[PDB]
Amino acid sequence: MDIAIHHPWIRRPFFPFHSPSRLFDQFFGEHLLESDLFPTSTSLSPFYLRPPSFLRAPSWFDTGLSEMRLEKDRFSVNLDVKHFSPEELKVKVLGDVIEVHGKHEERQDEHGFISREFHRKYRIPADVDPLTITSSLSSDGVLTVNGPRKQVSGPERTIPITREEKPAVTAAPKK
Amino acid sequence: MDIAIHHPWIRRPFFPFHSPSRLFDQFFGEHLLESDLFPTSTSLSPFYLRPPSFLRAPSWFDTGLSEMRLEKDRFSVNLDVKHFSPEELKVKVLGDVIEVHGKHEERQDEHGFISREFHRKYRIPADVDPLTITSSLSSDGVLTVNGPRKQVSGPERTIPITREEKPAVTAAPKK
Amino acid sequence: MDIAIHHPWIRRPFFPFHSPSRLFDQFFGEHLLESDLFPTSTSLSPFYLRPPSFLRAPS
Amino acid sequence: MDIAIHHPWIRRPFFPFHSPSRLFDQFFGEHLLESDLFPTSTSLSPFYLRPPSFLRAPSWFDTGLSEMRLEKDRFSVNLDVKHFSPEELKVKVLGDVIEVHGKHEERQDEHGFISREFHRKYRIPADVDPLTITSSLSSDGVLTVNGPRKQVSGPERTIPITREEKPAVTAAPKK
Amino acid sequence: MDIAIHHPWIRRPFFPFHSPSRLFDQFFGEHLLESDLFPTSTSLSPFYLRPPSFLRAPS
Amino acid sequence: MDIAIHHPWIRRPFFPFHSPSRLFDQFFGEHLLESDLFPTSTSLSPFYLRPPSFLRAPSWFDTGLSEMRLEKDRFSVNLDVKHFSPEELKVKVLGDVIEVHGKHEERQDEHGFISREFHRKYRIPADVDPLTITSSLSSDGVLTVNGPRKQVSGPERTIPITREEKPAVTAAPKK
Amino acid sequence: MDIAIHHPWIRRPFFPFHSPSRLFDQFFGEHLLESDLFPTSTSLSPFYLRPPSFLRAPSWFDTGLSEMRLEKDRFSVNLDVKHFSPEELKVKVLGDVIEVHGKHEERQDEHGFISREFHRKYRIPADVDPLTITSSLSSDGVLTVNGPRKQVSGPERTIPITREEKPAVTAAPKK
Amino acid sequence: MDIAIHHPWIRRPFFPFHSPSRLFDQFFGEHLLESDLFPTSTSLSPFYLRPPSFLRAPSWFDTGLSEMRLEKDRFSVNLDVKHFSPEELKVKVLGDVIEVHGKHEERQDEHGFISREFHRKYRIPADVDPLTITSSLSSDGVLTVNGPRKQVSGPERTIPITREEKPAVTAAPKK
Amino acid sequence: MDIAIHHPWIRRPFFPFHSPSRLFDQFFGEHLLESDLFPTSTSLSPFYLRPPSFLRAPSWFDTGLSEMRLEKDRFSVNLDVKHFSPEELKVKVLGDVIEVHGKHEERQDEHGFISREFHRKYRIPADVDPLTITSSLSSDGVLTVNGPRKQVSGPERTIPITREEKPAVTAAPKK
Amino acid sequence: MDIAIHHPWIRRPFFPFHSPSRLFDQFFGEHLLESDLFPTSTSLSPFYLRPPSFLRAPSWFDTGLSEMRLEKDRFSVNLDVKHFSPEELKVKVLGDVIEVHGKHEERQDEHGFISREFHRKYRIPADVDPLTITSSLSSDGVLTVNGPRKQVSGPERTIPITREEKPAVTAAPKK
Amino acid sequence: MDIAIHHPWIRRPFFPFHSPSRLFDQFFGEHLLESDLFPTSTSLSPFYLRPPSFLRAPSWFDTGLSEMRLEKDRFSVNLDVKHFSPEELKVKVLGDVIEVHGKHEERQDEHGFISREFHRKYRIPADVDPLTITSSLSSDGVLTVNGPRKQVSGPERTIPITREEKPAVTAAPKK
Amino acid sequence: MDIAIHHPWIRRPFFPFHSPSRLFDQFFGEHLLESDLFPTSTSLSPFYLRPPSFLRAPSWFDTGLSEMRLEKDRFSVNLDVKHFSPEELKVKVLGDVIEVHGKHEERQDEHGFISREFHRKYRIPADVDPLTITSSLSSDGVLTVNGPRKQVSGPERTIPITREEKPAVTAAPKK
Amino acid sequence: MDIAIHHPWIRRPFFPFHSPSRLFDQFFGEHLLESDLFPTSTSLSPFYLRPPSFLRAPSWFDTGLSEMRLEKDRFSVNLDVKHFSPEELKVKVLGDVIEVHGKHEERQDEHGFISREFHRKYRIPADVDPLTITSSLSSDGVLTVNGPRKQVSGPERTIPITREEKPAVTAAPKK
C-alpha cells in the first residue's frame, strides 16, 4: 500500500476535485433528501441528484434511464432449448422475469446416462408482463413467450427501516 | 459495558432523535447565550431555552418554576423539638434558611448520660424573610417561626470567571 | 473517578476543535454581548449610569 | 513542557481570545481568497486581510508597507571598500540588489600572504533600478552606485503549483 | 526536525477533514475565481484579449 | 465501574450480611439437595429452601405459591377478536396455553389491502384443561373458551443431564 | 529476598510449626469471637485466646497482665524540672497521664537568650488517678504529684465500626 | 492439549466420580494418618486405606499382598550361565537379592577376542534368606542357589525427614 | 527538543567555555566552603566566590552589593492612600518591611457598595528601622513613615539542617 | 524495599558520615597497598589500615589482635570423650587444630545397636604445636593433649593470583 | 560476542596492564597538550608523547620517523610505461606526489579496440620537490623524473576547528 | 489484502497451474543458461526460452520479434516542427534515435514573450542508420530525415557483473 | 557484525564460488558415503573425498598424509631431563605416545624447597612401537628411548553410534 507513496500519489490526480466538503456524503445527502420529499419546483425527478460538475453552461443530474429499458418494440421473445424436452421442461413467469428449465437425456453410455439441461434467465421488464405474456413450445424445444410489453422492474434490497422521530436512549460510566 | 452490544443497542432507541447536530451543546448554547444578553423580542425569559422537541403545534421552552415555590400562604412555620430545651436550643435564621439546634439529655444511665438532639433544615424562601420572620418557643420545645414571606433562594456554585476580552498567549515546539 | 481513563478520553473528542484558550465560553459571550447590546440589523433601545473614574479618554 | 501545567497555563492568557472559530485558518482563509479574485467593493487592497480585532470604532486590515520602502530620495548610494582593489573588485547589479566583491592583499608575512575582502549586499528596490543605476569607483576603493530609483522587490518562494480543476483519483481496501 | 514525531502529529488534526487530494487550496480557489469574475448577485465588470489558438469550439 | 470506589462502596450496604460463608452457594446447596431426596421430617415441601434470615422468631422458607395460580373460580375465558374472522381464525389449545389466531382484511386501499390480526397468548393453567376446555365463537369475533379448571403449568428448561455415579477420566502433562 | 532461597529456607524451621490450618487467622478467630460474647464456662478472661502450643501437660492462654500494672504501692511520684520555673511551668493531669511543661531561660548570650525546657510524659495508670492526684512544686523545680493510686489505662485505636446484621448490595457486568 | 476441548472432555466421564472433596488428598490423608498411629479397633492394617468406592455391600481397602509374594515352596532357585565360567564368575547374595556375574570368552577372532557375559538379577525375598541360602555351581555354568525361604523385601526411597513439632520461622516485608 | 539538533547546537556556543571540570558544582563548591569557614587571608569576603573568568588582568569575585541598598539618605518614606481612611487603615512595621492597609468605601450604588483599598509593600531595610521608624497620617490618606535608616534585610529560605559528623546507616540485599 | 522510604531513610543517619569519597574502597585501598609494599615510616603494621575516624586527638588503625591470641599459658588441654573408646577413638593433630573422633556403642536394643560419638574441633594455635603437643588417653575416655604452646594460625582463602604487569588484550565491534 | 565469555576473557591477558586510569585518554591527553604548547624543558618533540611502558631503565616516547622518509640519495626516479605513449601520456608533479597517466591502444580486434593504461602513484616527499624535480620521457615509454630531493609530506585530515575561549549557550526543561 | 481471502482465492484460479516446481525460476533458469552458452542442437535461438505450456501438439518458445521492427521499407521519415525555426532548431542523430529540438517565439504579449517548442523522440532502429540517415529542413519547419534503413537497437540496463570464478570468503560467530 | 555491511560484503568474494548446491554438505556427503562402503573402482582411497575444485586438467581429492608421518628413519629418540632424577623419574610408553615425568629438588631456600620438573609429551607413531621401543637413562637425566619404528596413531573422538536399521517413533498434537 506504500503509505509513503500511494497516499501522496493518489492525492495527486484529485486536487482539481478537492475542496468537495470534507462531509460531501452528508452535505449533498441532505439536499437530496429534501428534494426527495416534495417536488421542489424542479423539472420533476425520480431520483435525480445534483452532483458537483465542472460543466459551466449546463446543469448535470445523476440519473438512470439506461438501467431500465433500451431496445424493445412489440414482439415475442423466445427461450432456448436446443433439444426437445416437452414433458421435462418447466416455464416460469415470475413477474418481469421469464425463465425456462428443460432437462433431457440425449447422451447415453454403458451404465451411465448423460442429461443435458438448458436454463434461461430473462429479466426483461420492458418485454414481460406476467398478466398477458404467455408461452408456446415447439417440437424441437424452441420455447417462445409471446405477448405485449412495456414495464420496469429489478429486485433490490435497499430498505433501511427504523428511526422515526421520538426515541431516546441512555447510558452511564462503566469499567 | 459490552462495546459490541451496548454501543449499537444504546444507539438503537435513539434513531428517532439522531441528527441533533454533532455539536448540539455548542450550537444551541450560542443561541441561548444570545438571548441571555439583551431581552430579545420574546415573552421574556428568566432562562427559557428553546430545546429540540417533537411538538409541532406548540413551542416548548426549558423553564424552572417548580424549583422555586409551590404551595404557601400567610403561614407561620413551626420547627420540631419533641423535648424541651429552652437553654439548650439555638434558632438560626440564615437568610431564607431556618434551622433549629436543640439538644437535651433526657435518658440517663449508671455512668453514661444520653443526649438527644433535634436539628431541622428549612430552605423555604417563599416562606421566610430574615427581616420579619421571627421565632417563638414553647415549654415543650415546639418552636414556631412566624411572619410573612414571598421570595426565592437557593445557594449554588455556578460562576465561571475570566475570559475577559482580549488576552492572548503563545507557545513553541519542544520535546 | 477514572482520572487516568475518562480524563484523557473526554479531552480526546475536544481535540477536533481544541488548541485556543482554556475557556471558550466567555469571550464569545462578551463579544456577542457588546454586539447584541448595540442596534444591529434592527433599531435601538438603551439605559445606563455614570460613576467617578480615572479614565480621561474613555468612561 | 509539562502538559499538566503549560497546557492549562498557555490557554489561560488566551482566555478572552478563544472562540476564534476552531477552523480560523480556513474560515478567514476563504474570505481572503474571495477578495483575492475580483476587486471586491473595498478601498482596494494588494493583500489586505480583514483580521479579528478588538477595535470597535475602526476596521483593521493586515498590511505591509513597512516591508517595501521607507526613507529614500534622489540619492546615489555608495558601496564600501576600505582598501582599493580596482582590478580585484567586481560590482554586480543583479536587479534591485547591488553587491560588491573586492579582495586585496594588504597584509604580508614570511611565506603567508593575507588577503582582505569586502562584500556588501544591498537589497534596496526603492533605491535601485538595474536599467539606470550605474557604478563609479574611487582610488581608495570607495564604490558609488549613482542613479534614480523608485521600485519594490524581494525574492520569495511562495508558488503553490498544482490543484487545477477536474482531476479525479481513487483507491481500495488493503491489508 | 522531528520527522518521526511532528510529521505524524501534524497530519493527525488534518484527518477530521483529510481524505481527498494533497492540494486543496487551488481548485476551490480557481472555482471561486471563475465564479467571482462572473456577475453573481451584483452585475457587470469585464476586460480581456484574444491570441491565436488551435481550439475551434472554445477560445 | 471505578474499582477504587464501586468495590469498597458496593461492599458497604452488605456488611450486615457479610460472612455468609464464602461458599454459600454450595453449602446451602448441599442441604437443599439432601431435603430434595427424601421428606426429611419437614412440614413437607416441593422446594422450601431454608435461607439465611434475620427473623429470630419465625423460620422463613423459599416458596413459589405466587407463581402458579391466584384469582380463579369456575367460568369461561374470552379471547379477543374485535373483528369477525370465522373462516380466518384458528383457535389452539396447546395444553394449559390457550391461543387465538384471527386475521381479517377490513381496511382497503387502491391497490393495497390492509389486514388486521388479533393474537392472544393465555398461559392460564388454573383456568385451562385441554380435555374439557372447549371454544365457542361469536359473529363479531368474540371467542370464548368455556369449561372447568384447576391445574399448574409453565414451560421451563432446567434439566441437567449426565453425572451418574461411576465415570472417571484422566490426562497428562503437555507443552 | 532471593525467592529461590529465602522462600524454601524460611519454610524450613517452620516445619515443627507447620500444619497450623491454612486459615489459622480465621479459624481460631471465630473461636475467640465465640468466647468474647458470653463467659463460656471458662476460668473467666477478658481476652484469654487459646493458642496452638506444644505444651502437653498445661494449657496456655494469650494474655496481658505485664502491660497494665507492675511495681506500685502508695507513692507520691516526682516530676523533673532541674531548674525552677514557678511561673513558667504548667502541670497537666490528663487522666492517667501526668505531664509537666516547664521552660526557663538560664543561659544568656550577647543578643541571644537560651531557654531550657523539661517535659515529662508519665503513662502511669497504676499510680495515677486524676480525681485524687494533686501536684506540689518546690523552689528548685522539683514537682511532686502526690496522691493514692490503683487503675489501668492506655489510649489505643481499635474500634472497627459498621457491619451489623441485615444490609444487602449488588452489582452487574461491566466493560 | 486443546484447553477448549480436552479440559471439558476430560471432565465429561468424571462427573459420576466428582464431588470427592476438592481436598481429597489431604482429607483422607489425615484419616489414614490417624489409623497409622495406633490400631484403631480395625482388623489391623499394614497400610490398608479406606478409599471412595461405589461398592455398597462390601467395604474396600487399598492393600498390597500381590506385591510381596505369590507362588513358592521349598525350592532351590537356579541362576543362568549358559557357558561355564568357574573362575570368571562371582555369585553375590546381597540380602533378598541373588545375582550372578559370569563372563567367559568363547568366541575368538584374528586379533579380537569376544567375551560373553550372563548377569541375573533376582529380587526374590520369599525365596531367599542371606543366612541359609547358599550356592552350587556346575561344570556347564548352571548355578543353583539352594535353601529355605519365607520373607519379604523391596528397596524403596520414601523416608520424609524433619518436621517434628515446636520450631518455626519468620520473615518481614521487602522487595 | 530535537535531541539531534538542540543537543549539538546548544553545545556549540559552549566550546570556548567547555572543559570547566565535569564536576564544577562540587570542585569550586569545596573551595568556597573552605573560605566560608575562616578568613583565608583574603580581602575579607562575606560570600565572594572566586569564579572562572576570561579576565586575565583582574580577579573577579561573585558578590552582591546591588541587592541590599542603593539610593537612600535620611528622610521619610510616604505610603499611598489616595482617599482618606483613618479609622479603616492599619499601618504595620514588621521589621524592615513597611506596609499599609487602608480600605474606604467611596463608590456607592443602589444596593451595592463599592470599597476601594490601597496596599503598599515596602521592603526597604536601608531605609527603615522598626525601632525608630514611626508613622504620620494625613487627612487625605497620605501616610508618611518618618525616621532614620541604614541596615540590610531580606527573608530567604536557605537553611540546610542535619548532616553533622558521626551518623552511619546500613542496608542489605533484597528482592 | 520501599525505594521511596528505605532509600531516603537509610541515607538519613548517614549524613554525618557522607562525603567519604565516592570511591572510598579504591582511594584508601591504594594507600593501604602502598604501605603493604615497603615498611613505610610508621610503628610498623601487620595490616593496620588507617581508616576515617571522628577521633581528633588519637589516630586509629584497623587491626586484629583479638582474633589470634587471648588467654593462654603453659597448658595441657584435654579433649572430651565421656565414655571410653580406647580402640574406637582416633586423635588427630593436624597443625594448630586438635581433634578427637571416638565412637562407642553403649546403648543396646533388641535388634538395634546405638552408638554414641564425641567429636571435638579445637583451633587453638596459641595452645598447640604439632611438633611438641602430644596426647594421653584415660580409661574413662578423658583425652588430654599436653605440651607447650605459642603460635598463630587460621585457614583462609584469600589469594589473588592473576595480574602481573605486561599483559594486553583486544577486541572489535560485533553484532 | 559471548558477553559471558569474551568479556571476562578479553580482560584476562589485560590485568598486568589494568589500572591505567579509567580516563587514560584524557589524563595523558592533557599532559601531551601541555607539552604541545611551549617547548617544555625536554629533548624537544615534534609530537613525542610519554606513554605508559614497563621499561624501567629507559624512557620511551611515541614517535614517527619511520613514516616520513627512509632510504634515499641523489636520485632520478623512473615512472613505468611499458609501451610508448608520447602523445597519450601526461605526467603530473602535484607537490611531493609524482604520477604518470599513459594510455595506448596496442591490442586490436575486429570492431573492438583494446587500450592499455599505466598509472603510477608516487608519494615520495624525500625524493621529490615540485620546483627542481623534472621529467624525461623515452621512446619506449620509460619515464624518468630526475632532480635532487629531501622533504616530507603526507595529506591528512586532522583539523579540529571550533572552541576558542568565551562562547556561552544554554537551554531549559522540556516535555 | 485480506490474507484470509485473497490468499486462498488468488491460488484458486491457479488451481490447474499448480505443481510448477517450487523453484521454477531457478530450474528453468539453468536450462536456459545451458542453451545460452553453446548453440545446442536446435533451430538456434536469439534468446528463446522453452516455457511450460498446455500446448500438446506444438512446442512454444518465449521470443521477441515484435519488439524490434515491424512495418518499414525505404522511407524518409519526417520530424514535426509546425512553425519554422531554422536558426532555433537542432536535429540530433544519436544512433538509432532521431530527435528534433526547435523552439520559436510566435506568440507575443505586452512584456511577456511566449515561445513554443516541438520535440520529437524517434527510436526507429529499422528506419535509422547514423551513417547514411541525413536531415533536410523546410521553410515551414517540416524536417525530413531521408536515407536507407534496416537495423535493431534499444538501450537497456541489464549487465550483471562480477562472479569471476575462483573467489571464496569467510566469517565467524559474533553478537 | 553490521548485517547491512558484513553480510553483502562477505558474500562478494564468494561471488565466483557461489552456486555450490545449497545443500553441499549433504549432496557430496552422500557421494562420499557411497565410496566409503565398497572400493568403487577408484585408485583406492582411505578417505579421499572429491571436492569442488577449479582445476580443469587434474582431479583433486581431499587427503591427509601430512598428518601421520613426515621425516623419520631408524632413530632412538631422547627425552629431556636437564637434571638427573633416577629415582624421581617415571617413563611411560602408552602406545605410540612416549612421555617422561621427572621431578628433582635442586634449588633450596631457608624453609622452602624448590622442585623443578621436566615433562615431555611425544606423540610419534612413526617413531614409537610400545612392543619394541625401550628406554635408557643417563646419570645426567638424559633419557633415550631406543628401538625400531613405523606406525600411525592419533586419539580422536569421532564415533557416532546407533542407527540400528528398523526403528521409527511417533507423536501427536498437544497444547
UniProtKB/Swiss-Prot annotation, chains A, B, D, F, G, H, I, J, K, L, M:
Residue positions where N6-acetyllysine is found in the record: K92, K166
Annotated positions for site Susceptible to oxidation: Y48, W60, M68
Q: Which residues bind Zn(2+) 1?
A: H83, H111, H119
Q: Which residues carry this modification: Phosphoserine?
A: S19, S45, S59
CDD domains recorded: ACD_alphaB-crystallin_HspB5 (cd06498)
- Residues carrying sugar: S41, T170
Q: Which residues bind Zn(2+) 2?
A: H104, E106
Chain ranges of the sHSP domain: 56-164
Per its UniProt record, what PROSITE patterns does this chain match?
A: SHSP
A GO term, aspect molecular function: structural constituent of eye lens
Q: What does this protein do?
A: May contribute to the transparency and refractive index of the lens. Has chaperone-like activity, preventing aggregation of various proteins under a wide range of stress conditions. In lens epithelial cells, stabilizes the ATP6V1A protein, preventing its degradation by the proteasome.
Recorded family membership: Belongs to the small heat shock protein (HSP20) family.
Q: PANTHER family of this UniProt entry?
A: ALPHA-CRYSTALLIN B CHAIN (PTHR45640:SF5), HEAT SHOCK PROTEIN HSP-12.2-RELATED (PTHR45640)
Write down what this protein is called.
Alpha-crystallin B chain
Q: Which organism is it from?
A: Homo sapiens (Human)
* Upper taxonomic lineage: Eukaryota, Metazoa, Chordata, Craniata, Vertebrata
Task: Report the gene name.
Answer: CRYAB
